[PDB]
Paper text:
Receptor usage determines host tropism and transmission of coronaviruses.
Although viral propagation was not observed in Caco2 cells overexpressing hACE2, abrogation of the N432 glycan (via the N432C mutation) resulted in detectable amplification of pcVSV-MOW15–22-S. Furthermore, introducing the E589K or the Q287K/E589K mutations in the hACE2 N432C background further enhanced pcVSV-MOW15–22-S amplification efficiency and enabled detection of pcVSV-PnNL2018B-S amplification, concurring with our binding data. However, the efficient amplification of pcVSV-MOW15–22-S and pcVSV-PnNL2018B-S supported by a P.nat ACE2 mutant (C432N) harboring an N432 glycan suggests putative evolutionary pathways by which these viruses could overcome this obstacle, underscoring the usefulness of the countermeasures identified here.
Numbering used by the authors:
A (entry chain A): 23 to 607
B (entry chain B): 387 to 403, 409 to 428, 440 to 473, 478 to 487, 491 to 594
Amino acid sequence: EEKAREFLDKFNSEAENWSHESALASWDYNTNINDKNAQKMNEADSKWSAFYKEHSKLAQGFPLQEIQNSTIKLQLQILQQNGSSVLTAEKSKRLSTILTTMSTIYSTGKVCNPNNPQQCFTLSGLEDIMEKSKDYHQRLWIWEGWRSEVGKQLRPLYEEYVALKNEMARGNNYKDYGDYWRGDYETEGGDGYNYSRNHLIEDVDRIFLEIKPLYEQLHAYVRAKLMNAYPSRISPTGCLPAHLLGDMWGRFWTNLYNLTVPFEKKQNIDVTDTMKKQSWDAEKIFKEAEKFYLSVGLHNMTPEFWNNSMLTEPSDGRQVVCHPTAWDLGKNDFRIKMCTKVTMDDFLTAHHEMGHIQYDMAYAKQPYLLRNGANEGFHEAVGEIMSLSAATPKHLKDLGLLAQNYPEDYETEINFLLKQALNIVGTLPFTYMLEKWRWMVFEGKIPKEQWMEKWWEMKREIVGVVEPLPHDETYCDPASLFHVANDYSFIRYFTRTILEFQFQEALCQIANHTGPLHKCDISNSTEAGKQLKNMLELGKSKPWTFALEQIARTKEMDAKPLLNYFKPLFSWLKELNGNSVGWSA
Amino acid sequence: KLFIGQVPQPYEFGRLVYNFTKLLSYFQVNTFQCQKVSLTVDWFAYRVEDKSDLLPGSSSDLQRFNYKPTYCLISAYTNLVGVNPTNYTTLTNCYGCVDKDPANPWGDQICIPEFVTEVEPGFRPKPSCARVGLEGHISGNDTYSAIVTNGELDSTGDPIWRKGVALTKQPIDSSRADLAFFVSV
Ligand SMILES: *[C@@H]1O[C@H](CO)[C@@H](O[C@@H]2O[C@H](CO)[C@@H](O[C@@H]3O[C@H](CO)[C@@H](O)[C@H](O)[C@@H]3O)[C@H](O)[C@H]2NC(C)=O)[C@H](O)[C@H]1NC(C)=O
Ligand SMILES: *[C@@H]1O[C@H](CO)[C@@H](O[C@@H]2O[C@H](CO)[C@@H](O[C@@H]3O[C@H](CO)[C@@H](O)[C@H](O)[C@@H]3O)[C@H](O)[C@H]2NC(C)=O)[C@H](O)[C@H]1NC(C)=O
Ligand SMILES: *[C@@H]1O[C@H](CO)[C@@H](O[C@@H]2O[C@H](CO)[C@@H](O)[C@H](O)[C@H]2NC(C)=O)[C@H](O)[C@H]1NC(C)=O
Ligand SMILES: *[C@@H]1O[C@H](CO)[C@@H](O[C@@H]2O[C@H](CO)[C@@H](O)[C@H](O)[C@H]2NC(C)=O)[C@H](O)[C@H]1NC(C)=O
Ligand SMILES: *[C@@H]1O[C@H](CO)[C@@H](O[C@@H]2O[C@H](CO)[C@@H](O)[C@H](O)[C@H]2NC(C)=O)[C@H](O)[C@H]1NC(C)=O
Ligand SMILES: *[C@@H]1O[C@H](CO)[C@@H](O[C@@H]2O[C@H](CO)[C@@H](O)[C@H](O)[C@H]2NC(C)=O)[C@H](O)[C@H]1NC(C)=O
Ligand SMILES: *[C@@H]1O[C@H](CO)[C@@H](O)[C@H](O)[C@H]1NC(C)=O
Ligand SMILES: *[C@@H]1O[C@H](CO)[C@@H](O)[C@H](O)[C@H]1NC(C)=O
Ligand SMILES: *[C@@H]1O[C@H](CO)[C@@H](O)[C@H](O)[C@H]1NC(C)=O
Ligand SMILES: *[C@@H]1O[C@H](CO)[C@@H](O)[C@H](O)[C@H]1NC(C)=O
Ligand SMILES: [Zn+2]
């Protein structure tokens, strides 16, 4: 152990040094996109990778069987895992080529109008249409078009991809690549703080069943609404048409809100006009976000944060990517990159991204390799709960953004919950179903000959969505989604959503919140903040179930907090729908 | 003056804005407790047997839907002969409702138990909630439920509907009134 301890100590010191240089070069690129910064980024990343691999190989000299300290054992497990290298040179190179190819096919995909070949849109255009248009035919040829133009090109690549990733996983002592992806949750330890990979399946399956009753109410409701929007297209007891779900994949139903809004006459809360009247700007927005976190006993934003961060879109001719991201560069250097406008959407986003910085700061004291979230879904879960709080009527009133005498309209709260349900609940069946499908594909439960047969069978049974047109096995609809084509784990969105409400509810209980969870504001709750920090400061140095207990007082994922959040919507939907809840397949 | 005429129920508590010994010559106090101690008095009918619901920090329907003190409590009984209450009516619940059909603001309602309408300390129950209590006190159903609106409008100008539950209890001693008095400086 002592030799491994010295090894990791040396590694961690140098790793922060090299990682910092890598992060700096990447930052400079993203806030100033040109050839000079791109070159610095590529060189700094290369130096980092060479460093990491050098020590990864050296780490093989420290058997885990000789280690008693959990901190050392854990860091060695991270540096030691081979990952891709367990593969031979030919398969490693081939896999890289395939992954690059799938990404390229997706990003350069376009679909042309079959009745007007001269009218053709790129993915960005197609998304804009699928997220806006109310025309049955326009949405249909785009939905089918995307599957034909992109899905059919990725099909054969996804098949080879699955085979190669499974071999990679086996070379690392996993059953398959699905098992590899379920690795991030797995933890070891005494008492009830251990978590086998197989347990993740049991938890997500158990949770879905607990969520389902809520979703059936939302589904039947949306069905009833779309039946009027698209007359004679939808069966009263059947599944929803896949192309009429608000976007290209049916991932978020948010854009259906205009069609499914419970009480159209009632507007939601939007303080954009107030922020503009009061002359808010990017700096003020982030300063208010800081005040929020400080009120619960968390840390200051560093002088370096305010100086280095890019909170506004440059007017100096510099080209940037405005997509909001939080950065941790190491050496106590924290930054946010976000082209903030004076809107409610960016107001809430500023809170979201600063939440990520607060988490990154919390475990800054930890060993480099352990400087991450307890799991993949912990970072976004922390961000989202801060947004939920920031968006409440109560918080907005206290900030002077929402009129103090603004009435408590129950119709508005139903519209709010409905909109939130379309985004948060509607996506859960999708995420669950998608991962269930992929895991079964990697595991070998769903054979190539039944990939689409089971994809759509599962869509009807789990999500309640039906394919507008029948598909054979030359299709690969899952691959037409960004996260699938680009080899990302999608379960993080399922677990994040569940954890999001466990954290919010637990913090709301500590804060002594009474009434509906969707109106909970954890501002000025230093007790909840302390309980939160107790979890945040751990990074991934402890079993994530240990980290979970520190905040939610449980060692397992729990659906109840979500059901509680949307409980007022559930009751409304239930009485509105009566006995037409649910669907046939 | 507060002993002249009838006595209001918890959901419609009266408010009015001295010699304590003389007060004790009108009523017999069973519980006298003070918190952190022009004067304002909030008063309503309430049973002695369930007097525990008058004490701060207790979890009860009285302090949730009818009246929650903002921070001395005098729980006492007296014969007003004013007049004595026939019975005691307390809201056990109240929650927001929305219209089933958006095309008709006055039509069939869907009520949501989770949209709990809290009394809010120092505030009367919202008029939709108070109306339920007022009806329950006269309906004679031992527990009275109703979906009502009472002159309060939303951000558009449509009626605000609420559903409440008003539970009526019979006294053991029908010859006296049991009253709760909340006196603040
Ligand atoms: C978190 O706690 C802070 C205090 O540490 C709260 O800020 C304060 O908000 C109250 C109102 O809720 C302010 O008092 C009021 O000011 C207005 C004038 O704007 C006056 O008309 C009222 O009669 C009353 O005096 C108070 O001044 C203000 N404090 C500061 C330093 O701004 C904050 O709202 C809380 N956020 C919460 C509970 O969510
Ligand atoms: C609690 O005490 C109140 C009195 O303070 C009781 O209200 C009285 O209830 C009776 C019986 O329902 C009412 O008489 C009936 O009136 C209707 C007309 O609305 C008539 O059709 C019936 O034939 C009968 O005469 C009486 O009018 C009503 N008092 C008042 C002022 O309206 C209440 O019922 C008691 N609650 C319980 C649970 O005992
Ligand atoms: C849902 O309705 C809102 C309006 O209530 C739409 O937002 C407007 O869209 C038009 C057309 O692009 C803009 O000119 C307005 O400025 C937008 N208003 C606001 C407040 O942003 C929204 O696009 C509709 N959504 C869908 C899917 O149709
Ligand atoms: C990562 O790769 C190394 C090889 O570079 C693996 O180390 C071997 O492990 C086996 C036991 O399974 C030993 O018999 C070999 O002698 C080891 N070789 C070397 C060079 O150390 C290591 O086990 C792999 N990591 C994992 C988790 O499988
Ligand atoms: C934590 O580890 C314990 C074992 O120490 C696991 O309990 C076993 O679970 C398997 C599978 O259900 C059973 O067949 C064994 O009989 C159980 N053993 C004991 C002693 O109970 C436990 O499930 C693990 N916890 C998690 C979340 O994976
Ligand atoms: C949240 O509410 C609980 C009561 O429901 C509070 O707990 C009591 O707090 C007082 C001190 O304020 C103690 O004397 C009691 O013994 C506590 N009761 C129990 C059962 O714990 C709790 O302090 C409140 N939390 C906050 C942050 O206000
Ligand atoms: C593991 O090593 C760290 C030093 O990196 C030390 O602080 C910790 O107490 C050790 N834990 C055990 C169980 O020895
Ligand atoms: C945050 O910054 C403010 C302003 O300088 C300071 O008063 C406060 O103590 C700081 N809080 C923490 C936890 O550092
Ligand atoms: C921000 O940092 C740069 C670093 O070169 C410095 O030149 C600039 O003056 C700083 N701006 C401040 C401190 O407001
Ligand atoms: C009156 O009581 C009966 C019997 O419990 C009940 O069925 C009815 O709904 C009640 N009516 C009201 C207004 O509470
Ligand atoms: Zn995020």
